[PDB]
Design a protein around this ligand. Structure first.
Ligand SMILES: Nc1nc2c(ncn2[C@@H]2O[C@H](COP(=O)(O)OP(=O)(O)OP(=O)(O)O)[C@@H](O)[C@H]2O)c(=O)[nH]1
Ligand SMILES: Nc1ncnc2c1ncn2[C@@H]1O[C@H](CSCC[C@H](N)C(=O)O)[C@@H](O)[C@H]1O
Length: 261
C-alpha cells in the first residue's frame, strides 16, 4: 500500500506506447555513441566506459555518497563498469570483481583504462554463495527487474541479506543497489541496516523511470522512508505528465594505462 507499490501497479497498466514514453520522461543519460563505436572496434586504450554503470558510480563518488578507498570488492560486476571506475581512483589500492558471466549473464570486458592491472575479475561466480572477504569498500549492483512487485521485493531482500554478511566483516564504504526500496519489508530491512551500519538510500538521476531502484550508500544519512517516498512521488508525477524528454550528458572518459610501482 506504499506509494511505490501503487506506482508499480500503474506502471504495468500503461499501454506499450505509454510505457516507452514514460521510461525516458525527464531523465538524464550519458551519450554512449563514442564508447559503443570504440568497443565495437576492439579499442582498449581510449578510456571509454564498458557500460553505463561507470557514469552511475561516478555520480555517487563525485558528490561524496560513497568514498572509493583501499580494497574494493564489486559483487555482480558484469562487464566491469564499476571495477574500471574504481581502479582509476588514486585512493583505491586493489579491485576484486565477481560475476556470473554465463548462460546469458554479461562477462567481464577487458579494456586497459587506468588501473586495469589492479583489477582481478572472477566470473562463473554466484555471489550469494561466495564466502565474504575483508575489504574497505563494498560495491554491489545486483537486482533484476520483475513486473511483479512481490518478486522485486523478494529479489531485493535476498541481495540485502547477502550484502549484510559482507558488511558484517567491517567495511568503511559501500554502494549497494536496492531494486525495490518501495516494498514494505525492504524499507524495514533498510531501517535495520541503517541502525547497524549507517548510510541511507539515494536515487541516481541516471536511473530510468521504469525502475524504482535506489542505492544504499555510506556517505549520507537520512530518513529512508522519507527519501524513498520522495522518489515514488517523482516517478508518479512523471507518469501523469509523459514527454519522453531526455537530457544527454557526456559519458565518462578515464585516463589509460597501468598504475605502477
Ligand atoms: N505496461 C508496461 N510495462 C512494461 C513494459 N515493459 C516493461 N514494463 C515494466 O517496466 C519495468 C522496467 O523493466 P525494464 O526497464 O523493461 O528492464 P530493466 O532490466 O529494468 O532495465 P533495462 O535493461 O534498461 O530495460 C518492468 O519491471 C515492467 O513492470 C511494457 O511493454 N508495458
Ligand atoms: N547471483 C549473482 N552472482 C553474481 N553475479 C550476478 C548475480 N546475479 C546477477 N549477477 C550479475 O550482476 C550484474 C548486474 S549489472 C552490473 C553493471 C556494473 N555495475 C557495470 O558498471 O557494468 C549482471 O552482470 C548480472 O549477470
Amino acid at each position: 500500500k506504499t506509494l511505490g507499490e501503487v506506482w508499480k501497479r500503474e506502471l504495468n497498466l500503461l499501454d506499450k506506447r505509454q510505457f516507452e514514453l514514460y521510461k525516458r520522461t525527464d531523465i538524464v543519460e550519458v551519450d554512449r555513441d563514442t564508447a559503443r563505436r570504440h568497443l565495437a572496434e576492439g579499442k582498449v586504450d581510449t578510456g571509454v566506459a564498458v557500460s553505463r554503470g561507470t557514469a552511475k558510480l561516478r555520480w555517487f563518488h563525485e558528490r561524496g555518497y560513497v568514498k572509493l578507498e583501499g580494497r574494493v570488492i564489486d559483487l555482480g560486476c558484469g562487464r566491469g563498469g564499476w571495477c574500471y571506475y574504481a581502479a582509476a581512483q588514486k585512493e583505491v589500492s586493489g579491485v576484486k570483481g565477481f560475476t556470473l558471466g554465463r548462460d546469458g549473464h554479461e562477462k567481464p570486458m577487458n579494456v586497459q583504462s587506468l588501473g586495469w592491472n589492479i583489477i582481478t575479475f572472477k566470473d562463473k561466480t554466484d555471489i550469494h554463495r561466495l564466502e565474504p572477504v575483508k575489504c574497505d569498500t563494498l560495491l554491489c549492483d545486483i537486482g533484476e527487474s520483475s513486473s511483479s512487485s512481490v518478486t522485486e521485493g523478494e529479489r531485493t531482500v535476498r541481495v540485502l541479506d547477502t550484502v549484510e554478511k559482507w558488511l558484517a566483516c567491517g567495511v568503511d564504504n559501500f554502494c549497494v543497489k536496492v531494486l525495490a526500496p518501495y516494498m514494505p519489508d525492504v524499507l524495514e530491512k533498510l531501517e535495520l541496516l541503517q541502525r547497524r551500519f549507517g548510510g541511507t538510500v539515494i536515487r541516481n538521476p541516471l536511473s530510468r523511470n521504469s525502475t524504482h531502484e535506489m542505492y544504499y550508500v555510506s556517505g549520507a544519512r537520512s530518513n529512508v522512508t522519507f527519501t524513498v517516498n520522495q522518489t515514488s512521488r517523482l516517478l508518479m508525477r512523471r507518469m501523469r505528465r509523459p514527454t519522453g524528454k531526455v537530457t544527454l550528458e557526456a559519458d565518462v572518459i578515464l585516463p589509460i594505462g597501468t598504475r605502477s610501482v
